[PDB]
Design a protein around this ligand. Structure first.
Ligand SMILES: *[C@@H]1O[C@H](CO)[C@@H](O)[C@H](O)[C@H]1NC(C)=O
Ligand SMILES: *[C@@H]1O[C@H](CO)[C@@H](O)[C@H](O)[C@H]1NC(C)=O
Ligand SMILES: [Cl-]
Ligand SMILES: [Cl-]
Length: 200
């Protein structure tokens, strides 16, 4: 299944001409047309939402923000964390801490005005987002990567205690996903060792 959000397909299927989010190409919950928006950096505006409200994000920070957009919109497994009473929303998707930490590090000197990027905006007539709070650095907005990942999208994400049973929006998620859906920990960690070996 896919999420029952604005843009999602009914069911995951291959998607040949994706411009971004290609991690999900051969089984995607987004149509390729959605990806066109993300093909060019700097990314100013995705759908009705401006990404540059406190300035233009550094490239690596933008990359991380794009990875989460691609997951929500295109991952064939996001719906496994579907909120049953709000079918466009996810809850408690387990993110790897290393992922959240690298992200924070990438964004630490960038600026932001929404502690929670989903709720903390003024939305105008045309659906476009405007800061209410003040622009501050990410390093002021959140105390660390963990705090950021638990805050940015409310209940959507959590930070796993496990370094293996967690998503980081790269090919290793194929290892994680097998075990997410003590024992499972060791299974995952062995599987992950094989993965790292196979990739030269
Ligand atoms: C994207 O394509 C799908 C089917 O190919 C279509 O249903 C949808 O309206 C398109 N979205 C936009 C924004 O053009
Ligand atoms: C991260 O920051 C939060 C909030 O300040 C704090 O509780 C926590 O100890 C810090 N470290 C981790 C790994 O969460
Ligand atoms: Cl196409
Ligand atoms: Cl990529």
């Amino acid at each position: 299944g896919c999420l029952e959000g604005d843009t999602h397909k009914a069911n995951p299927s291959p998607e040949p001409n994706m411009h971004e989010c290609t991690l999900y190409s051969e089984s995607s919950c987004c149509y390729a047309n959605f990806t066109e928006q993300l093909a060019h950096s700097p990314i100013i505006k995705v759908s009705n939402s401006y990404w540059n409200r406190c300035g233009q994000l550094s490239k690596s920070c933008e990359d991380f923000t794009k990875k989460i957009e691609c997951f929500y919109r295109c991952s064939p497994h996001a719906a496994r964390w579907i909120d049953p009473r709000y079918t466009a929303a996810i809850q408690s998707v387990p993110l790897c801490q290393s992922f959240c930490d690298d992200w924070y590090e990438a964004c630490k000197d960038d600026s932001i005005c929404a502690h929670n990027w989903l709720t903390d905006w003024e939305r105008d007539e045309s659906g476009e987002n405007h800061c209410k709070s003040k622009c501050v650095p990410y390093s002021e907005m959140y105390a660390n990567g963990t705090d950021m990942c638990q805050s940015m999208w409310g209940e959507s994400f959590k930070v796993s205690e496990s370094s293996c049973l967690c998503l980081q929006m790269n090919k290793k998620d194929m290892v994680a996903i097998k075990h997410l859906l003590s024992s499972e920990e060791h299974a995952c960690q062995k599987k992950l060792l094989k993965f790292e070996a196979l990739q030269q």
